[PDB]
Write a protein that holds these residues in place. Structure first.
Motif, PDB file in Angstrom:
ATOM      1  N   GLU A 131       8.150   7.129  -5.989  1.00 30.36           N
ATOM      2  CA  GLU A 131       8.162   6.536  -7.355  1.00 30.36           C
ATOM      3  C   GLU A 131       9.347   5.577  -7.506  1.00 30.36           C
ATOM      4  OE1 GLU A 131       9.390   8.934 -10.670  1.00 30.36           O
ATOM      5  OE2 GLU A 131       7.800   8.134 -11.959  1.00 30.36           O
TER       6      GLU A 131
ATOM      7  N   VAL B  21      16.973  -1.500  -6.264  1.00 28.61           N
ATOM      8  CA  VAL B  21      18.347  -2.083  -6.264  1.00 28.61           C
ATOM      9  C   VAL B  21      19.343  -0.974  -5.925  1.00 28.61           C
ATOM     10  CG1 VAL B  21      20.160  -3.023  -7.766  1.00 28.61           C
ATOM     11  CG2 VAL B  21      17.848  -3.979  -7.868  1.00 28.61           C
ATOM     12  N   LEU B  22      19.242   0.173  -6.601  1.00 28.62           N
ATOM     13  CA  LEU B  22      20.128   1.232  -6.330  1.00 28.62           C
ATOM     14  C   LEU B  22      19.986   1.626  -4.929  1.00 28.62           C
ATOM     15  CD1 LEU B  22      21.717   2.144  -7.996  1.00 28.62           C
ATOM     16  CD2 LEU B  22      20.136   0.878  -9.005  1.00 28.62           C
TER      17      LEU B  22
ATOM     18  N   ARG C 265       5.220   0.929 -16.651  1.00 27.39           N
ATOM     19  CA  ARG C 265       5.246   2.283 -16.186  1.00 27.39           C
ATOM     20  C   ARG C 265       4.092   3.000 -16.683  1.00 27.39           C
ATOM     21  NH1 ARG C 265       8.703   3.706 -12.836  1.00 27.39           N
ATOM     22  NH2 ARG C 265       7.873   5.740 -13.419  1.00 27.39           N
TER      23      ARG C 265
ATOM     24  N   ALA D  97      11.365   5.388  -9.686  1.00 26.10           N
ATOM     25  CA  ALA D  97      11.670   5.192 -11.124  1.00 26.10           C
ATOM     26  C   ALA D  97      13.156   5.459 -11.370  1.00 26.10           C
ATOM     27  CB  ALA D  97      10.812   6.103 -11.963  1.00 26.10           C
ATOM     28  N   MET D  98      13.709   6.476 -10.706  1.00 21.84           N
ATOM     29  CA  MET D  98      15.145   6.822 -10.871  1.00 21.84           C
ATOM     30  C   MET D  98      15.978   5.944  -9.933  1.00 21.84           C
ATOM     31  SD  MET D  98      15.271   9.064 -13.211  1.00 21.84           S
ATOM     32  CE  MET D  98      16.971   9.612 -13.067  1.00 21.84           C
TER      33      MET D  98
ATOM     34  N   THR E 208      26.205 -10.000  -3.184  1.00 21.28           N
ATOM     35  CA  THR E 208      25.190  -9.493  -4.026  1.00 21.28           C
ATOM     36  C   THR E 208      23.945  -9.977  -3.450  1.00 21.28           C
ATOM     37  OG1 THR E 208      24.940 -11.409  -4.990  1.00 21.28           O
ATOM     38  CG2 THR E 208      26.533 -10.133  -5.575  1.00 21.28           C
TER      39      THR E 208
ATOM     40  N   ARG F  25      11.800  -3.207  -2.572  1.00 20.19           N
ATOM     41  CA  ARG F  25      10.710  -3.072  -3.573  1.00 20.19           C
ATOM     42  C   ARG F  25       9.413  -3.592  -2.947  1.00 20.19           C
ATOM     43  NH1 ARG F  25      10.661  -5.195  -9.908  1.00 20.19           N
ATOM     44  NH2 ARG F  25       8.529  -4.511 -10.367  1.00 20.19           N
TER      45      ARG F  25
ATOM     46  N   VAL G 152      22.535  -8.158  -1.386  1.00 23.61           N
ATOM     47  CA  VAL G 152      22.006  -6.901  -1.784  1.00 23.61           C
ATOM     48  C   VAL G 152      20.700  -7.198  -2.417  1.00 23.61           C
ATOM     49  CG1 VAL G 152      22.793  -6.851  -3.821  1.00 23.61           C
ATOM     50  CG2 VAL G 152      22.176  -5.186  -3.110  1.00 23.61           C
ATOM     51  N   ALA G 153      20.561  -8.383  -2.850  1.00 18.31           N
ATOM     52  CA  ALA G 153      19.548  -8.415  -3.810  1.00 18.31           C
ATOM     53  C   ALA G 153      18.307  -8.445  -3.035  1.00 18.31           C
ATOM     54  CB  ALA G 153      19.647  -9.650  -4.558  1.00 18.31           C
TER      55      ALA G 153
ATOM     56  N   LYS H  27      16.266   3.112  -8.531  1.00 16.51           N
ATOM     57  CA  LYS H  27      15.740   1.722  -8.515  1.00 16.51           C
ATOM     58  C   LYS H  27      15.902   1.136  -7.109  1.00 16.51           C
ATOM     59  CE  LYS H  27      16.186   2.945 -12.810  1.00 16.51           C
ATOM     60  NZ  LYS H  27      15.225   2.861 -13.936  1.00 16.51           N
TER      61      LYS H  27
ATOM     62  N   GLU I  36      17.188   3.438 -17.680  1.00 16.43           N
ATOM     63  CA  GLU I  36      18.496   3.552 -17.165  1.00 16.43           C
ATOM     64  C   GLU I  36      18.577   2.753 -15.931  1.00 16.43           C
ATOM     65  OE1 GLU I  36      16.156   4.436 -16.533  1.00 16.43           O
ATOM     66  OE2 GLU I  36      16.215   5.575 -14.713  1.00 16.43           O
TER      67      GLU I  36
ATOM     68  N   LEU J  82      14.814  -9.047 -10.504  1.00 18.87           N
ATOM     69  CA  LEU J  82      15.607  -7.892 -10.338  1.00 18.87           C
ATOM     70  C   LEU J  82      16.917  -8.443  -9.930  1.00 18.87           C
ATOM     71  CD1 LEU J  82      15.170  -6.599  -7.547  1.00 18.87           C
ATOM     72  CD2 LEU J  82      14.310  -8.545  -7.931  1.00 18.87           C
TER      73      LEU J  82
ATOM     74  N   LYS K 111      14.917  -6.528  -2.958  1.00 21.37           N
ATOM     75  CA  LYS K 111      13.670  -7.181  -3.177  1.00 21.37           C
ATOM     76  C   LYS K 111      12.732  -6.705  -2.186  1.00 21.37           C
ATOM     77  CE  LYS K 111      11.697 -11.747  -3.353  1.00 21.37           C
ATOM     78  NZ  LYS K 111      12.084 -13.181  -3.163  1.00 21.37           N
TER      79      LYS K 111
ATOM     80  N   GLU L  96       6.419   0.694  -4.393  1.00 21.54           N
ATOM     81  CA  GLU L  96       6.075   1.923  -5.154  1.00 21.54           C
ATOM     82  C   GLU L  96       5.807   3.075  -4.181  1.00 21.54           C
ATOM     83  OE1 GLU L  96       3.360   1.133  -8.311  1.00 21.54           O
ATOM     84  OE2 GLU L  96       4.018  -0.951  -8.531  1.00 21.54           O
TER      85      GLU L  96
END
Lengths: 58, 620
Positions: free
Chosen positions: A39, A46-47, B386, A41-42, A20, A31, A23-24, A44, B419, B476, A28, A36
């Motif tokens: 966006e 992390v994703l 946001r 926003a969807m 992890t 990000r 991954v983290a 993440k 989400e 995070l 990080k 940014e």
DNA sequence: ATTTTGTAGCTACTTATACAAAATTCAGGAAAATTTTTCTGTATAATGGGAGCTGTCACGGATGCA
DNA sequence: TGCATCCGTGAAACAGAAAAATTTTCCTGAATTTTGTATAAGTAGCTACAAAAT
């Protein structure tokens, strides 16, 4: 799929911790770097981090 | 983290105690000590100037404000007040200063004293009611000098005898021995401080080899302390003490209460007490009052101190306006609620939300309901962020306000914030790790938490009104590992036993049962025939057969039937591949025909569903 | 054929400077005024308190022992 | 000496005083504007003026 990837990710890697964290921190950076950018926003950071580490990296 | 490695438990010698509150100033003259037991003034409320809340020795409660005055701003910081000697340094400097009391009389630390081994005694080789007498002013001791004559060392002169020791006065022969009759701890002091001890753990260890069948337990003990002391730098004398530290005030905070009334703290109370007793006592020796007062007195002092340390330990539990035992220093850090065990292993965080709970059908597992009301607050900030990202909100207060206005975004942005962002749920305190897992917060209306049946067993929930509690993860990174390793999906099975733990449990079993059972007399669509496609299904919606109705089904795969039948039964020896052969379930074509060209299964039309349902969920 | 362009020009003409004391106020001091806090006395005689509580444990000790 | 009990755990006085404080006054003093006030040029104006484009 991301889910199965998330699985495969740690179904064949180092300590489930060990992962992890990396991954983290990655995300990080994902990000911090690309701060940014899209966006995100969807998807993440992390994703992202996961997919680009569970499929891209794999 | 990288500020220190190991801690150093130990004792506070009177220098170190007095080294807890010196706050020497540039006028050059020391402070930290408190010359008053009272608290804030009656007229104004300010902290006297030498009482339990003296600022100049703890710190200016009013950030940068010399109790004197003159300066009311950070501007005046390093600089202090000439006139008051207030140490101008914000206010967080308090809660940490300490101050202390020079004691007008020594007090055998309750802890070392009435302790399980009464170490004092352990080292004094003198049981209680004897050394216990000596404090408490209740007997006397010979002293090394006092017994240099007929007197025997450590002989308790009590008083009558002590007076008889004054009798047979030096006006007669002998009586040239010394004094230090141990009426008070002042002498227990130099008992301790008497002894050397390098001889102990060796000269004393002479015993230890000897007296093979002797007490043993006694000795070795007495060693190991000694040894220890010498091994550390611990001189037993340090045990009695002489000067007392004092808690940074606010932790004994004390506080205006709205209704005007005040919130006194037993701390400053025990304390102040001992102050008086002290002072007064100093005034008693100052007025050279006849002993037995002053004697008495000390005795008291003594135990005022005491109780401070630990109420109710030995003498009579103090009971003040609280109409109950007070709360000594010890006990606030002890018990079930000692600092340790409850503020410290168990603190009481925010970013949380509880509620009742309810089955959340429609919502799948690894999801949770979430009320809208709570979900906001949990996620408060993130959202506002946001906002500012979308720009819709400019400042925050902007947001703040807008947030309460529940603008479209409030119920639009949010859930994009949300989400992905796991959450952790828990039904009451839960030893079990699985007791709490990670969960995806989906919004939902009313106020409950939706909740999935499959996970119910884990948390072990009713739905008769249980409640749960939510927390949310932040770094995070901390999200990561929610996902990664608590995400309620992926944990199927008891960590205490490979067994699964998700298991469809009630009725859902009996659905499946009833699905798959074997209603007898099954006639509608019984003994029928099928060939993949889920054909039979169709037939089922057209009721061509009955949900419960045995019927052949072309399936080249494997059964398991229960009740294995493997061996044939009634093979149909006719022609090509026609041995063709039955089974209590199967029906098949090998020989010339091939190997298994025929493969009709004797199964009810439900079970086929089921099998199917798995199936497809599983691979594809 | 005036008009706008000029050039060769200033003078008026006006910032700019910098000082500058004068204001002009402000702060602090100093009282001083006074209000509030302390201090001290009190004369027949007076000479041990309050309470209750009464349902685990343990253990190690339990010295104490008979 | 194992075997008692038996610590104590986890669950209202006062009057008289004075002295403080304090605190309002002051004042004052200074310090601190503003304005006056110069100041000094340079000036950017400005006002005719002139020849040559409507």
């Amino acid at each position: 799929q991301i889910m199965h990837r998330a699985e495969d990710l740690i179904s064949a890697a180092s300590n489930r911790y060990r992962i992890t964290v990396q991954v983290a921190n990655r995300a990080k950076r994902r990000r911090y770097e690309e701060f940014e950018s899209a966006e995100d926003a969807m998807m993440k950071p992390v994703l992202r981090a996961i997919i680009e580490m569970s499929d891209e990296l794999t | 983290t990288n500020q220190f490695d190991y801690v150093k438990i130990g004792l506070a010698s009177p220098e170190r105690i007095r080294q807890w509150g010196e706050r020497t100033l540039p006028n050059g003259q020391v402070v930290g000590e408190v010359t008053k037991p009272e608290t804030i003034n009656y007229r104004t409320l300010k902290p006297e100037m030498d009482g339990l809340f003296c600022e100049r020795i703890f710190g200016p409660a009013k950030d940068w404000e010399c109790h004197c005055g003159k300066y009311k701003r950070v501007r005046h910081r390093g600089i202090v007040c000439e006139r008051c000697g207030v140490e101008v340094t914000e206010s967080r400097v308090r809660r940490h200063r300490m101050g202390y009391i020079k004691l007008a009389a020594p007090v055998a630390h309750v802890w070392y004293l009435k302790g399980i081994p009464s170490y004092i005694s352990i080292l004094l080789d003198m049981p209680l009611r004897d050394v216990e007498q000596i404090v408490y002013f209740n007997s006397y001791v010979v002293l090394s000098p006092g017994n240099a004559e007929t007197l025997t060392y450590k002989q308790l002169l009590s008083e009558d005898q002590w007076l008889e020791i004054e009798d047979q006065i030096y006006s007669e022969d002998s009586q040239l021995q010394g004094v230090e009759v141990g009426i008070g701890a002042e002498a227990l002091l130099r008992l301790l401080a008497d002894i050397n001890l390098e001889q102990e753990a060796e000269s004393l260890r002479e015993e230890i080899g000897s007296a093979k069948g002797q007490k043993r337990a006694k000795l070795i003990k007495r060693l190991r302390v000694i040894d220890n002391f010498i091994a550390t730098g611990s001189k037993p004398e340090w045990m009695v003490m002489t000067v007392i530290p004092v808690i940074p005030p606010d932790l004994r905070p004390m506080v205006q209460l709205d209704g005007g009334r005040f919130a006194t703290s037993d701390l400053n109370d025990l304390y102040r007490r001992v102050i008086n007793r002290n002072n007064r006592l100093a005034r008693l020796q100052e007025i050279l009052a006849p002993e037995i007062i002053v004697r008495n007195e000390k005795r008291m002092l003594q135990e005022a101190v005491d109780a401070l340390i630990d109420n109710g330990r030995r003498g009579r539990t103090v009971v003040g306006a609280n109409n109950r035992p007070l709360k000594s220093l010890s006990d606030i850090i002890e018990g079930k609620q000692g600092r340790f065990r409850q503020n410290l292993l168990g603190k009481r965080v925010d970013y949380s939300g509880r509620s009742v709970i309810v089955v959340g059908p429609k919502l799948k597992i690894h999801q949770c309901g979430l009320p809208r009301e709570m979900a906001i607050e949990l996620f408060q900030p993130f959202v506002i962020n946001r906002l500012i990202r979308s720009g819709m909100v400019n400042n925050i207060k902007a947001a703040k306000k807008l947030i309460s206005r529940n603008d479209p975004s409030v119920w639009d942005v949010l859930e994009e914030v949300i989400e992905g962002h796991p959450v952790m749920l828990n039904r009451a305190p839960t030893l079990h790790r699985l007791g709490i897992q990670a969960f995806e917060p989906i919004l939902v209306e009313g106020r409950a938490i939706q909740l999935h049946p499959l996970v119910c067993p884990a948390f072990n929930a009713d739905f008769d009104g249980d409640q749960m509690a939510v927390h949310v993860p932040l770094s995070l990174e901390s999200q990561a590992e929610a996902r990664l390793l608590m995400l309620a999906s992926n944990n199927i099975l008891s960590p205490a036993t490979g067994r699964p733990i998700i298991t469809p449990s009630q009725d859902m079993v009996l659905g499946a049962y009833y699905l798959t059972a074997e209603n007898p007399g099954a006639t509608k669509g019984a003994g029928k025939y099928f060939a993949s496609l889920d054909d039979v299904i169709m037939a089922f919606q057209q009721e061509q057969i009955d949900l419960h109705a045995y019927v052949y089904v072309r399936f080249d795969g494997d059964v398991e039937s229960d009740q294995p039948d493997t061996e044939p039964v009634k093979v149909t020896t006719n022609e090509d591949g026609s041995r063709t052969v039955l089974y209590k379930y199967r029906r098949v074509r090998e020989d010339a025909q091939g190997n298994v060209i025929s493969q009709y299964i004797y199964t009810t039309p439900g079970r086929v569903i089921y099998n199917k349902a798995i199936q497809e969920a599983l691979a594809s």
